[PDB]
Amino acid sequence: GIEVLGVKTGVDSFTEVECFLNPQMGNPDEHQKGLSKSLAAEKQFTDDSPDKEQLPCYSVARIPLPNINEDLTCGNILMWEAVTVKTEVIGVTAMLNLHSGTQKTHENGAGKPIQGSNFHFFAVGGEPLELQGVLANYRTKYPAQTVTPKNATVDSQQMNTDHKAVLDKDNAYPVECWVPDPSKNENTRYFGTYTGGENVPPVLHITNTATTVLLDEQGVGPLCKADSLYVSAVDICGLFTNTSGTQQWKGLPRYFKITLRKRSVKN
Amino acid sequence: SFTEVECFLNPQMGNPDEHQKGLSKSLAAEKQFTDDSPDKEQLPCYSVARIPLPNINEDLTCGNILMWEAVTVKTEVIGVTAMLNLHSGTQKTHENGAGKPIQGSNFHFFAVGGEPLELQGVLANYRTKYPAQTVTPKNATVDSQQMNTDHKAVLDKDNAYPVECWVPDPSKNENTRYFGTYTGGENVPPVLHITNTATTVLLDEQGVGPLCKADSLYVSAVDICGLFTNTSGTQQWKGLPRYFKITLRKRSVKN
Amino acid sequence: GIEVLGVKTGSFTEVECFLNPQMGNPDEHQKGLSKSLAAEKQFTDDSPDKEQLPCYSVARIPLPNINEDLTCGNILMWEAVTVKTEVIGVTAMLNLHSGTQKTHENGAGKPIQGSNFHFFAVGGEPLELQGVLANYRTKYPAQTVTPKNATVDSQQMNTDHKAVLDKDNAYPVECWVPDPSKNENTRYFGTYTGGENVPPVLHITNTATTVLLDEQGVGPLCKADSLYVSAVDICGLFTNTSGTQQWKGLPRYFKITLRKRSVKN
Amino acid sequence: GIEVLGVKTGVDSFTEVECFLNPQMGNPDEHQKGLSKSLAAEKQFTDDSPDKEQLPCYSVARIPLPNINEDLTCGNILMWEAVTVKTEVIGVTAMLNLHSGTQKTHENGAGKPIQGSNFHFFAVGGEPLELQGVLANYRTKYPAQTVTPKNATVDSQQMNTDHKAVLDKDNAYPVECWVPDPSKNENTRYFGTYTGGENVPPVLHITNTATTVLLDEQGVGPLCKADSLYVSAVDICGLFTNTSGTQQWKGLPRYFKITLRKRSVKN
Amino acid sequence: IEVLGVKTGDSFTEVECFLNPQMGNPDEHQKGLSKSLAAEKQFTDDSPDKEQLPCYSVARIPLPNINEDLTCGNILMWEAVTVKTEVIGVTAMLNLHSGTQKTHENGAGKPIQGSNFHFFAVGGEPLELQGVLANYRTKYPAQTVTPKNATVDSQQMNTDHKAVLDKDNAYPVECWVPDPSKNENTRYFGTYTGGENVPPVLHITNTATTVLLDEQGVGPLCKADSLYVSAVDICGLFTNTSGTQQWKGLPRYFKITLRKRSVKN
């Protein structure tokens, strides 16, 4: 694809960009941002039609970078190369509120903390994140305003190589439908952890001293095509339990801080 | 001198019908030791695929030839977010609550080798009556619940060797590298990591990776994620596919 | 920011500090605890007392003055290099007889457990904060500093909620987190664990050191000859005989080593 | 101890030995190898006489090495020196059988997996493993077919330095009576982990790529007396629960693969 | 103490020690256990028996004399360099039949579990302690050394509560922690886990060594040719058939290597 050349060093060679990404859990109304719509259980396989507000989606933001080429008709040009990232989950202490709309754990007791299944994930790339579709129930009837696997079949619950896509739209790709495709993503770095179980305790660390290096085995980081940097994220912290017993997913925003350098490439 | 091959391996949990791929049949309990006859669809089996590589020799009567040597592997579990579906055919944790997530006993395992994975048989109940269409330990005896060195086999057939019957044999497998973790308990939470930045090196303490005999590369896997609980309370194993990406180099060997 | 020069040699100094927790302290007899915690309150009518809300702890530590003339092109500042930090009184929770609730007939008291948050920071200036709310319509008490003009977006990103930890027992933990888009002159570390049955796990030692230098080899530079230490140590919930619960906190110790650095002025 | 001199390896200076060790959980009858007899509870401190089949014991095997044919009349001889070991627990997937004689977890549910307290342990030495006795109840009346601490007293529940022994017999030394003695065992390397709690989930890893080095701080591995090697093991995986509710310890076999070299010692 | 560079040689030595636990020992038949534990007691009327309170363990170990005259300007002291340490008798808890409570109909006995605390220290002098109390109004028995003049602040920081571990089986674990603002001549390590259902996790081996040298490359220097070892090993709670509970402890082994160090005086 791209012939990679020398890295420009010294002054006016580096740059930093930052970004706060909101979660996309569903947002049933205006007062419930950060949550999903009350969740439904025990739906029959052949009659499951979930609302969009019940389905958390991938978050994505494209970050525009400074144009580094005065002349786009040259043999050698330069591209921005992502070198490192600091990333952080925002508002973890908010869950120490056990009094607002909570269900008591017992008589005279405090409210039940947010807990259960979770998924924390982030990616950095010079292009949209490439996805592969996998379904728990291939007969699920997904709502309009969501991009899900087309022509879902028997094999969509295992390997169906037809379900390829890219994360090009925010709050559109349901988390439960898509995973990052390991057979692609040559120009993206991604990291995720899934934990399942309704009583699973969230464990969340914060610091400004942790850095992730984005260079590959060749010493090359993601190269930003069209002077665009893509950041993607999912941060399902668990389930919020209402006084009534109804539950909805909780999400939190995510921060990015990426350092890039100029690399020469062949045009 | 170098080359890459990749592979998606489907899980083999049982597949009771075309609408339930990835699942096992409904699991049975409390069966008598002397009368336990499981259906094949109730028994998850090892997955295996043989990958053909480019031919590199021309006269195998020569003293010195080239073989493909497996150097590194990237491997990944496919579809982990699928389990965030808590509405399809699930059982509610409580009145008004969401569905119960997949959980319980699990087993995640992969291997890379220049020949079929060598197995050793061990049985929980040596008197189990295993179905046709499966390869289980022959002439199972009292000692099959501990060490019975007669139960040797190789993983040469997909969806045939029941996971609960066989383990990789540590006294062999000189030409294979394998890795596995078992977790037991009905409430065990699955913990699954994904990334494209993790690489496993396949060279041994001598600096030699698996040498591919007959220009064949073998990949094996089991990925039992846990139990799916139906609304009625009945349960079935859940599995997910596994991806492989192996890098190989040409090596010189005796003949 | 500040352009740094060279380091004084052969020049050092150490400072230490015990920081009390600020869980709420409902009365003179219950230091280290919050007030009894409420549950199941209506989103549009939730008015928590101050004593129910644990707050960030902070202390500003004055350092020796090093300069005679601040018009000089080269000036010296104290540079924080390492810290040892420790949670004080972890064995106190082995008391299962004082005001406890028995786990069963004939059993011992229920140990402190549940959601926890352990956090510390070292910087040459106050810790910079970002506001995030679980419920943006919460009516916070007087005598506390919380996010101003809270809106719909205060439950996710609202970049208007910026603040600094300049006051002890004032900033509720549940309202603020350290701001990763700032804090260039501070190092912070924290872990949150959620769940009412979560077991506390707490290590103690005098052999663990944290290095405070950044990727450039520069530690926090202390502005106005001031060193700031901040902390939260919510260990979990204490369960009274009656079943009513209240947060438990413990003090935190700091031991910081600093060197003189020449700085451009 | 033994006086050793520097290392000098050549050709024909190495060798490997391997071994499968069966577990010794009790074996209540022929059909229940790898299990113990149903366990008792709530027994009185002063009248507690457990059956041998209820008590798991240490496993041990003496392994013969190639005779280096040294005449021990001279001050300088050769001994086998254990350098590395690969070790593995055999048959971990067997516990994925949840249908044979199990107790269901709930209506229409699968059988309850093996779980609870466990202990996994192995040792390699040039002589029998040296043991120290410690008892939970010093007044326990142990069955004749076991080696247990002699003249057990009040202090046998803490430190009683009289209870010294060696692991020289297989299926004789009850696990609950003995631990390896840290004040001895100069010529043995041992490793063990205990986990307590009736609902503890077993976690068991398998691989053929993990090696343990047996050299001490001086760079000397176990020196094998009389051209003999010793391997010891315990692998209590947890409790098996019958349909009725009775429980029995489960064990699994253990594999060893030891590499040795010839070493000069002072005789 | 000002140290000199390291010496060679007849320059080394090893000492070992088995330390019994001090859980309370309610009678001759119940060593390694505490007395049955009380619960739900009133804050203002809580008087624990000594046998209900586990205490720190401590031994002083005498070392070979090395100086003829302690008035000389250049002296030798023993310097602790490494330690191997081990918990003794972990398999004893595989006894689920002696005086146990069954988990269910037909089931085995309930294993020891719950809150635990495992801790050890090596130093050239007694371990220095800081007092912290869960309930400052607790009335401690006369066979114990506890914080004097306990006040409101004894539940957080009260810098008056300083002490040293100079007596075995006298300093209640729930009252004292090692003081991080001192202990320059001691190395300590501890972990607390809280929760009544917490599973004990205990590793044993003879291949693990801890190095006792500080960031300067100096280990504890044994004053008056004496070495101090301290320990706590609360494994959890033992549950009787009746449902009553008592702490369980196990002995701890030490093996320390020392070298002769030149020092100034």
JSON list of N, CA and C in Angstrom, two decimals, chain A residues 193-226:
[
{"chain": "A", "resi": 193, "resn": "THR", "atom": "N", "xyz": [-11.37, -5.13, 26.68]},
{"chain": "A", "resi": 193, "resn": "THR", "atom": "CA", "xyz": [-11.63, -6.21, 27.63]},
{"chain": "A", "resi": 193, "resn": "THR", "atom": "C", "xyz": [-13.13, -6.35, 27.91]},
{"chain": "A", "resi": 194, "resn": "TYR", "atom": "N", "xyz": [-13.64, -7.57, 27.73]},
{"chain": "A", "resi": 194, "resn": "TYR", "atom": "CA", "xyz": [-15.02, -7.90, 28.10]},
{"chain": "A", "resi": 194, "resn": "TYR", "atom": "C", "xyz": [-15.09, -8.71, 29.39]},
{"chain": "A", "resi": 195, "resn": "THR", "atom": "N", "xyz": [-15.98, -8.31, 30.30]},
{"chain": "A", "resi": 195, "resn": "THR", "atom": "CA", "xyz": [-16.27, -9.09, 31.50]},
{"chain": "A", "resi": 195, "resn": "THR", "atom": "C", "xyz": [-17.78, -9.37, 31.61]},
{"chain": "A", "resi": 196, "resn": "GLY", "atom": "N", "xyz": [-18.14, -10.65, 31.74]},
{"chain": "A", "resi": 196, "resn": "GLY", "atom": "CA", "xyz": [-19.54, -11.04, 31.82]},
{"chain": "A", "resi": 196, "resn": "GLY", "atom": "C", "xyz": [-19.95, -11.58, 33.18]},
{"chain": "A", "resi": 197, "resn": "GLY", "atom": "N", "xyz": [-21.18, -11.27, 33.58]},
{"chain": "A", "resi": 197, "resn": "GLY", "atom": "CA", "xyz": [-21.73, -11.67, 34.88]},
{"chain": "A", "resi": 197, "resn": "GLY", "atom": "C", "xyz": [-22.45, -10.52, 35.56]},
{"chain": "A", "resi": 198, "resn": "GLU", "atom": "N", "xyz": [-23.65, -10.77, 36.06]},
{"chain": "A", "resi": 198, "resn": "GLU", "atom": "CA", "xyz": [-24.52, -9.68, 36.54]},
{"chain": "A", "resi": 198, "resn": "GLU", "atom": "C", "xyz": [-24.02, -9.06, 37.85]},
{"chain": "A", "resi": 199, "resn": "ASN", "atom": "N", "xyz": [-23.12, -9.74, 38.54]},
{"chain": "A", "resi": 199, "resn": "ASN", "atom": "CA", "xyz": [-22.60, -9.24, 39.82]},
{"chain": "A", "resi": 199, "resn": "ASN", "atom": "C", "xyz": [-21.13, -8.81, 39.75]},
{"chain": "A", "resi": 200, "resn": "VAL", "atom": "N", "xyz": [-20.60, -8.71, 38.53]},
{"chain": "A", "resi": 200, "resn": "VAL", "atom": "CA", "xyz": [-19.20, -8.34, 38.33]},
{"chain": "A", "resi": 200, "resn": "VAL", "atom": "C", "xyz": [-18.89, -6.91, 38.81]},
{"chain": "A", "resi": 201, "resn": "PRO", "atom": "N", "xyz": [-17.92, -6.77, 39.72]},
{"chain": "A", "resi": 201, "resn": "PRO", "atom": "CA", "xyz": [-17.48, -5.47, 40.21]},
{"chain": "A", "resi": 201, "resn": "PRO", "atom": "C", "xyz": [-16.61, -4.72, 39.21]},
{"chain": "A", "resi": 202, "resn": "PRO", "atom": "N", "xyz": [-17.01, -3.49, 38.86]},
{"chain": "A", "resi": 202, "resn": "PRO", "atom": "CA", "xyz": [-16.15, -2.63, 38.06]},
{"chain": "A", "resi": 202, "resn": "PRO", "atom": "C", "xyz": [-14.83, -2.33, 38.77]},
{"chain": "A", "resi": 203, "resn": "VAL", "atom": "N", "xyz": [-13.73, -2.37, 38.01]},
{"chain": "A", "resi": 203, "resn": "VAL", "atom": "CA", "xyz": [-12.41, -1.99, 38.49]},
{"chain": "A", "resi": 203, "resn": "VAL", "atom": "C", "xyz": [-11.79, -1.02, 37.50]},
{"chain": "A", "resi": 204, "resn": "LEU", "atom": "N", "xyz": [-11.63, 0.23, 37.93]},
{"chain": "A", "resi": 204, "resn": "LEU", "atom": "CA", "xyz": [-11.21, 1.30, 37.02]},
{"chain": "A", "resi": 204, "resn": "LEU", "atom": "C", "xyz": [-10.08, 2.13, 37.59]},
{"chain": "A", "resi": 205, "resn": "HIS", "atom": "N", "xyz": [-8.96, 2.17, 36.87]},
{"chain": "A", "resi": 205, "resn": "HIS", "atom": "CA", "xyz": [-7.78, 2.91, 37.29]},
{"chain": "A", "resi": 205, "resn": "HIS", "atom": "C", "xyz": [-7.66, 4.24, 36.55]},
{"chain": "A", "resi": 206, "resn": "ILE", "atom": "N", "xyz": [-7.17, 5.26, 37.25]},
{"chain": "A", "resi": 206, "resn": "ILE", "atom": "CA", "xyz": [-6.91, 6.56, 36.64]},
{"chain": "A", "resi": 206, "resn": "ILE", "atom": "C", "xyz": [-5.50, 7.06, 36.98]},
{"chain": "A", "resi": 207, "resn": "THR", "atom": "N", "xyz": [-4.87, 7.71, 36.00]},
{"chain": "A", "resi": 207, "resn": "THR", "atom": "CA", "xyz": [-3.54, 8.29, 36.17]},
{"chain": "A", "resi": 207, "resn": "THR", "atom": "C", "xyz": [-3.18, 9.14, 34.96]},
{"chain": "A", "resi": 208, "resn": "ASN", "atom": "N", "xyz": [-2.22, 10.04, 35.13]},
{"chain": "A", "resi": 208, "resn": "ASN", "atom": "CA", "xyz": [-1.71, 10.82, 34.00]},
{"chain": "A", "resi": 208, "resn": "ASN", "atom": "C", "xyz": [-0.27, 10.43, 33.66]},
{"chain": "A", "resi": 209, "resn": "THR", "atom": "N", "xyz": [0.15, 9.27, 34.15]},
{"chain": "A", "resi": 209, "resn": "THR", "atom": "CA", "xyz": [1.54, 8.81, 33.99]},
{"chain": "A", "resi": 209, "resn": "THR", "atom": "C", "xyz": [1.65, 7.58, 33.08]},
{"chain": "A", "resi": 210, "resn": "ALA", "atom": "N", "xyz": [0.52, 7.08, 32.59]},
{"chain": "A", "resi": 210, "resn": "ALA", "atom": "CA", "xyz": [0.52, 5.89, 31.73]},
{"chain": "A", "resi": 210, "resn": "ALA", "atom": "C", "xyz": [0.45, 6.24, 30.24]},
{"chain": "A", "resi": 211, "resn": "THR", "atom": "N", "xyz": [1.42, 5.74, 29.48]},
{"chain": "A", "resi": 211, "resn": "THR", "atom": "CA", "xyz": [1.48, 5.97, 28.04]},
{"chain": "A", "resi": 211, "resn": "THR", "atom": "C", "xyz": [1.50, 4.66, 27.25]},
{"chain": "A", "resi": 212, "resn": "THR", "atom": "N", "xyz": [0.74, 4.62, 26.16]},
{"chain": "A", "resi": 212, "resn": "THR", "atom": "CA", "xyz": [0.77, 3.48, 25.25]},
{"chain": "A", "resi": 212, "resn": "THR", "atom": "C", "xyz": [1.50, 3.85, 23.96]},
{"chain": "A", "resi": 213, "resn": "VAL", "atom": "N", "xyz": [2.44, 3.01, 23.55]},
{"chain": "A", "resi": 213, "resn": "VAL", "atom": "CA", "xyz": [3.20, 3.24, 22.33]},
{"chain": "A", "resi": 213, "resn": "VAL", "atom": "C", "xyz": [2.50, 2.58, 21.14]},
{"chain": "A", "resi": 214, "resn": "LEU", "atom": "N", "xyz": [2.40, 3.31, 20.03]},
{"chain": "A", "resi": 214, "resn": "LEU", "atom": "CA", "xyz": [1.55, 2.88, 18.91]},
{"chain": "A", "resi": 214, "resn": "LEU", "atom": "C", "xyz": [2.36, 2.35, 17.72]},
{"chain": "A", "resi": 215, "resn": "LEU", "atom": "N", "xyz": [3.68, 2.29, 17.87]},
{"chain": "A", "resi": 215, "resn": "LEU", "atom": "CA", "xyz": [4.54, 1.75, 16.82]},
{"chain": "A", "resi": 215, "resn": "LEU", "atom": "C", "xyz": [4.40, 0.23, 16.72]},
{"chain": "A", "resi": 216, "resn": "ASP", "atom": "N", "xyz": [4.44, -0.30, 15.49]},
{"chain": "A", "resi": 216, "resn": "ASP", "atom": "CA", "xyz": [4.31, -1.74, 15.26]},
{"chain": "A", "resi": 216, "resn": "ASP", "atom": "C", "xyz": [5.67, -2.42, 15.29]},
{"chain": "A", "resi": 217, "resn": "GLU", "atom": "N", "xyz": [5.71, -3.72, 14.98]},
{"chain": "A", "resi": 217, "resn": "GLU", "atom": "CA", "xyz": [6.97, -4.47, 15.08]},
{"chain": "A", "resi": 217, "resn": "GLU", "atom": "C", "xyz": [8.05, -3.86, 14.19]},
{"chain": "A", "resi": 218, "resn": "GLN", "atom": "N", "xyz": [7.64, -3.02, 13.24]},
{"chain": "A", "resi": 218, "resn": "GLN", "atom": "CA", "xyz": [8.59, -2.40, 12.31]},
{"chain": "A", "resi": 218, "resn": "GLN", "atom": "C", "xyz": [9.03, -1.01, 12.77]},
{"chain": "A", "resi": 219, "resn": "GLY", "atom": "N", "xyz": [8.43, -0.53, 13.85]},
{"chain": "A", "resi": 219, "resn": "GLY", "atom": "CA", "xyz": [8.73, 0.81, 14.36]},
{"chain": "A", "resi": 219, "resn": "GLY", "atom": "C", "xyz": [7.93, 1.88, 13.64]},
{"chain": "A", "resi": 220, "resn": "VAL", "atom": "N", "xyz": [6.78, 1.51, 13.10]},
{"chain": "A", "resi": 220, "resn": "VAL", "atom": "CA", "xyz": [5.90, 2.46, 12.42]},
{"chain": "A", "resi": 220, "resn": "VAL", "atom": "C", "xyz": [4.55, 2.55, 13.13]},
{"chain": "A", "resi": 221, "resn": "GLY", "atom": "N", "xyz": [4.13, 3.78, 13.45]},
{"chain": "A", "resi": 221, "resn": "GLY", "atom": "CA", "xyz": [2.81, 4.02, 14.01]},
{"chain": "A", "resi": 221, "resn": "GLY", "atom": "C", "xyz": [1.79, 4.26, 12.92]},
{"chain": "A", "resi": 222, "resn": "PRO", "atom": "N", "xyz": [0.50, 4.34, 13.28]},
{"chain": "A", "resi": 222, "resn": "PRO", "atom": "CA", "xyz": [-0.56, 4.62, 12.30]},
{"chain": "A", "resi": 222, "resn": "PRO", "atom": "C", "xyz": [-0.28, 5.89, 11.48]},
{"chain": "A", "resi": 223, "resn": "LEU", "atom": "N", "xyz": [-0.46, 5.80, 10.16]},
{"chain": "A", "resi": 223, "resn": "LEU", "atom": "CA", "xyz": [-0.26, 6.95, 9.27]},
{"chain": "A", "resi": 223, "resn": "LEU", "atom": "C", "xyz": [-1.61, 7.56, 8.89]},
{"chain": "A", "resi": 224, "resn": "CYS", "atom": "N", "xyz": [-1.75, 8.86, 9.14]},
{"chain": "A", "resi": 224, "resn": "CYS", "atom": "CA", "xyz": [-3.06, 9.51, 9.06]},
{"chain": "A", "resi": 224, "resn": "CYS", "atom": "C", "xyz": [-3.40, 9.97, 7.64]},
{"chain": "A", "resi": 225, "resn": "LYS", "atom": "N", "xyz": [-4.29, 9.21, 7.00]},
{"chain": "A", "resi": 225, "resn": "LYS", "atom": "CA", "xyz": [-4.72, 9.47, 5.63]},
{"chain": "A", "resi": 225, "resn": "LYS", "atom": "C", "xyz": [-5.65, 10.68, 5.57]},
{"chain": "A", "resi": 226, "resn": "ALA", "atom": "N", "xyz": [-5.47, 11.52, 4.55]},
{"chain": "A", "resi": 226, "resn": "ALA", "atom": "CA", "xyz": [-6.29, 12.71, 4.40]},
{"chain": "A", "resi": 226, "resn": "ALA", "atom": "C", "xyz": [-6.19, 13.62, 5.63]}
]
